[PDB]
Structures are given as C-alpha cells and as structure tokens.
C-alpha cells in the first residue's frame, strides 16, 4: 500500500513561502497532467477505484506516461493509505487514449488487465475520459524525507499541498507540522484526493 502524509497549504502565499524556504533542498520540478477514465455509469468510482493516465515531464528529458489503478483509499488525520499499482506505457499510446478511450483496449498493459479482470470488463469500448488537470510538483530532500509540494491547477482555481510517502507517517507528519508551524505557514490536513476535488468541481 501507498502511505503518505498529506497536508493542504491554505493559500498561494503559503505555497510561495514554503517553496522559497525549501530552495536549498530542491531536487527537481515535475509537470504532470493527470487524466482519468471510467464508464459513464461511474463503475470504477462507485467501487472507490480510480484509473489514471499520468503524463509527466522534467535533455534528455522524454515525456512519460504512467497508468495507475488506485483502490480502497482512506484519508484521515492528514494520513492517506491506498492500494496502488502503476505501470509505464508508451507516451504516444497514452496520448491517443485521452482522445479515444476505447484505445485502452489496444494496450498490452498489466494494470489494464487488472482493471478488466477485477472490475468485470472484457474491453474498454464503453469507457470515457473523465478529463483531467495539471499539477506542478516540486520535490525536496529535506531532513531525511522526500517532500512533494504540489500546485494543482483546476479550471475552478488552484490548490496547494504537501505530500510525503513514508513508512513512519506519524513521526514525519509531526516533523513537518512543527516546521510549518515555526515558519508560520498556513496549513491543514488534506481531506480529499486531487481526483475527488477535481470531480467536485469546486475548491475545498
């Protein structure tokens, strides 16, 4: 399972201050476009599953496409746990699927096989693209952990987050909140996944 500390930064101002503070620890900046697929009846969603194609970038810096299936999420007290499985596919192939989701059927993918077998589909001809959104992710190596600071760009406005994948979520969360508190950065627990915010059509 994927386990993460997940905190929301309440304002663009908080986000700007945090990235400024973490400058020396900066590792890389990733541009991610997240796109999602399901049947029009929301078969996957109704079973709390999410099928995502992520396009990411940031010479040589070829873009990549990663398919992921996430299921059975739990998000509580700033700590997220979810079943996650991901697999790289050819970028040009993923791109075509956004425009024609039936073409998910034409991919020799282990994860897409899982979706078929576990959710009861023989193909993806009945699937639609739910759309997606862009996210900018700054990655920092800070005090023994990898912090991911996100600026998530929805059409209804931007959202900002800090995430940290860790086996010690309680210790790491404390360590992070202490730092944010001392630096007077405004935050709270993140109560929804990016996909959930996206689907709600409104900011948290």
């Amino acid at each position: 399972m994927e386990v993460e500390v997940k905190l929301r930064l309440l304002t663009a101002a908080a986000h700007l201050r945090l990235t400024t503070l973490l400058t020396p620890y900066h590792l890389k900046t990733l541009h991610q476009r997240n796109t999602f697929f399901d049947t029009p009846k929301n078969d996957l969603s109704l079973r709390r599953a999410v099928l995502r194609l992520r396009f990411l970038q940031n010479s040589p810096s070829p873009p990549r496409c990663i398919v992921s299936l996430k299921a059975k999420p739990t998000l509580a007290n700033g700590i997220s746990r979810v079943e996650e499985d991901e697999e790289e596919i050819e970028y040009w192939i993923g791109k075509e699927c956004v425009e024609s989701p039936a073409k998910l059927s034409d991919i020799g993918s282990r994860v897409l096989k899982r979706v078929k077998e576990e959710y009861g589909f023989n193909d993806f001809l009945g699937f639609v693209c739910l759309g997606g959104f862009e996210n900018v992710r700054n990655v920092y190596e800070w005090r023994g952990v990898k912090l991911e600071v996100d600026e998530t760009k929805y059409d209804f406005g931007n959202c900002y987050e800090i995430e940290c994948e860790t086996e010690e979520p309680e210790r790491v969360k404390t360590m992070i909140e202490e730092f944010l508190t001392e630096e007077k950065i405004e935050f709270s627990n993140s109560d929804m996944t990016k996909f959930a915010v996206f689907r709600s059509g409104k900011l948290p």
Side-chain angles (χ1 to χ4, degrees):
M1 258 194 176
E2 179 175 274
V3 181
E4 286 189 335
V5 180
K6 193 179 198 173
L7 309 178
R8 190 176 49 148
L9 299 163
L10 276 48
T11 59
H15 178 263
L16 171 61
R17 181 130 109 265
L18 180 60
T19 58
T20 296
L21 291 174
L22 292 175
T23 303
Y25 308 91
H26 182 81
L27 188 61
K28 60 187 167 182
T29 302
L30 304 173
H31 296 67
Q32 295 172 326
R33 167 150 191 94
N34 298 299
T35 64
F36 304 85
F37 304 78
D38 204 344
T39 65
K41 298 310 180 173
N42 301 306
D43 279 283
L44 292 189
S45 276
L46 293 177
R47 299 175 58 172
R48 328 189 53 253
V50 172
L51 175 54
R52 177 181 79 198
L53 267 60
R54 171 175 287 164
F55 303 88
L56 56 160
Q57 187 155 36
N58 277 25
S59 317
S61 178
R64 292 152 58 205
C65 177
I66 309 302
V67 181
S68 84
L69 169 59
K70 285 195 181 182
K72 313 171 203 172
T74 63
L75 178 39
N77 318 331
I79 297 171
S80 165
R81 302 178 183 264
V82 58
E83 280 280 0
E84 178 253 1
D85 192 2
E86 67 193 348
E87 171 185 28
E88 178 161 4
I89 66 164
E90 297 294 18
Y91 177 94
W92 52 99
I93 296 301
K95 266 308 169 194
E96 304 190 0
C97 288
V98 175
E99 306 308 335
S100 319
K103 289 185 182 181
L104 284 169
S105 300
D106 301 333
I107 302 177
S109 160
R110 183 185 51 80
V111 169
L112 297 176
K113 182 65 164 187
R114 287 198 51 215
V115 177
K116 286 191 284 184
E117 301 298 300
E118 307 187 356
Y119 296 85
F121 302 110
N122 288 118
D123 59 56
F124 294 90
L125 302 179
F127 273 60
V128 292
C129 182
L130 301 181
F133 53 86
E134 308 257 350
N135 176 251
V136 175
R137 173 162 295 170
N138 290 104
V139 183
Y140 305 86
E141 305 179 310
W142 176 78
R143 311 246 199 106
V145 307
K146 178 189 301 298
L147 293 175
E148 300 164 39
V149 177
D150 289 330
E151 171 177 13
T152 308
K153 299 171 175 172
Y154 306 107
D155 47 54
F156 46 75
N158 293 8
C159 279
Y160 308 92
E161 278 193 296
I162 312 169
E163 293 178 316
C164 180
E165 176 167 7
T166 181
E167 88 284 13
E168 301 273 4
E170 293 183 53
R171 283 174 160 280
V172 170
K173 183 169 122 83
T174 300
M175 193 184 74
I176 293 169
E177 303 189 330
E178 283 190 10
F179 176 70
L180 298 177
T181 298
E182 298 170 341
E183 299 296 331
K184 307 162 197 174
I185 301 299
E186 282 185 350
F187 69 93
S188 62
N189 290 332
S190 181
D191 295 340
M192 300 168 79
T193 60
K194 291 181 171 66
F195 180 63
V197 173
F198 171 67
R199 296 287 284 162
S200 73
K202 58 181 184 59
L203 300 179

